[PDB]
Amino acid sequence: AMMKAAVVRAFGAPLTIDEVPVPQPGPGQVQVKIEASGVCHTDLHAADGDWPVKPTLPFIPGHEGVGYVSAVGSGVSRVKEGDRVGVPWLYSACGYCEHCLQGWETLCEKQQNTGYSVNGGYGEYVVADPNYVGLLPDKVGFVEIAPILCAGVTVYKGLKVTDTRPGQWVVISGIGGLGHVAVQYARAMGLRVAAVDIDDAKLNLARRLGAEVAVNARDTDPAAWLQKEIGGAHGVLVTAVSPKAFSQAIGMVRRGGTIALNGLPPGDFGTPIFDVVLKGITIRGSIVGTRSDLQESLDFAAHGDVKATVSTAKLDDVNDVFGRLREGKVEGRVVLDFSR
């Protein structure tokens, strides 16, 4: 009847860990018993409120929750009890608007979002729409697979919309939680990879993870060096949370190239329109991924092409996690482990 959960009740004060009621699945719904729950930067902004459209208090964050289906309402055919599933950012969509019909459910104006507009995976249980859960592969553990539910699918879809093809150069700007799996997806997609971050150790991660080129932003200029070495990149993926670098990205791309943006920092960034137009440059934002994007991105993990770098932590230490998460002292990703 009760469960442990990290409930945000005040739009900025640390999360509390309380016994709350276990959500029961109604018709068309299922219940998921959480084994692991990934922590995303988005969770910070949910706890805080750096976003125009804000969560409703109180709520439970977590859109990288993974576990088994523990119960099922009527009318459900996609999943059964004991199925291995994840509940990602896109909690549900109407399924029949123009966006949904065209396989862009990610843009559905009637969408609900896990751990933001409805309760998420920072609890021992979570109710989900079985039509939009991620179907998880057996061969990959809960802790290792959690980050794919958001970080993975986000950078996978992001790389797809750079419109770069095998043999061409992709730049991964920022080798963090997202960035570091981005390197791995890019390689599996046959791309040549260049990495660029403020941290020279993060650049070593990229090097090990497959990148054949990396330069430090806080040293030389990324643009000038890349235009110099590789001849500019055909595509750029910006994962870097920092407002700036959404400008030096325009410079690392060669003419006719595409920059996909994963970051969600605040405020307007300076866009050199003259150069964008003359160099025929494309700038494109990419929102996580569709259900197909997600399944494809999980497949890459199953096959061993992709493997998240992950720090484990306990539900009760959630606030500790948020702390070091902000101070950029987190390597790769952090995943809450519910294992007893």
Start-to-end C-alpha separation, the chain: 19
Binding range to a second copy, per CB under 8 A, among 183-191, 214-222, 243-251, 323-331:
243-251
- Using CB atoms within 10 A of its CB, is residue 307 exposed (0-12), middle (13-18) or buried (19+)? middle
Nearer to ligand NAD, 40 or 193 (CB): 40
- Using CB atoms within 10 A of its CB, is residue 283 exposed (0-12), middle (13-18) or buried (19+)? middle
User: x/- site string to a second copy, residues 103 to 142, per CB under 8 A?
Assistant: -x-xx-x----------------------------xx-xx
Residue position matching structure tokens 């719904």: 29
Residue selected from 40, 145, 186, 205 as contacting Zn ion according to rule CB under 5 A: 40
Residue 101's contacts (CB-CB under 8 Å, 6 or more residues apart) are none
Tokens of 332: 């790769």
The answer to the question of whether 97 is labelled as a binding residue is yes
- 327 membership: H or E segment, kind and range: none
Residue 256 interface partner, choices Zn ion, ligand NAD, a second copy, none, CB cut-off 5-8 Å depending on type: a second copy
Q: Which residues bind ligand NAD (CB under 6 A)?
A: 40-42, 45, 89, 150, 154, 173-178, 196-199, 202, 217, 239-242, 244-245, 262-265, 277, 286-288, 325, 328
Nearer to ligand NAD, 116 or 142 (CB): 116
The answer to the question of whether 108 is labelled as a binding residue is yes
Residue 188 interface partner, choices ligand NAD, a second copy, Zn ion, none, CB cut-off 5-8 Å depending on type: none
Cα–Cα distance for residue pair 138/326, rounded to 1 Å: 33
C-alpha dist (Å) from residue 203 to 72, 168, 194, 196, 261: 45, 20, 10, 7, 20
Which residue positions form the known binding site for NAD(+)?
A: 40-42, 45, 177-178, 197, 202, 241-242, 262, 264, 286, 288, 333
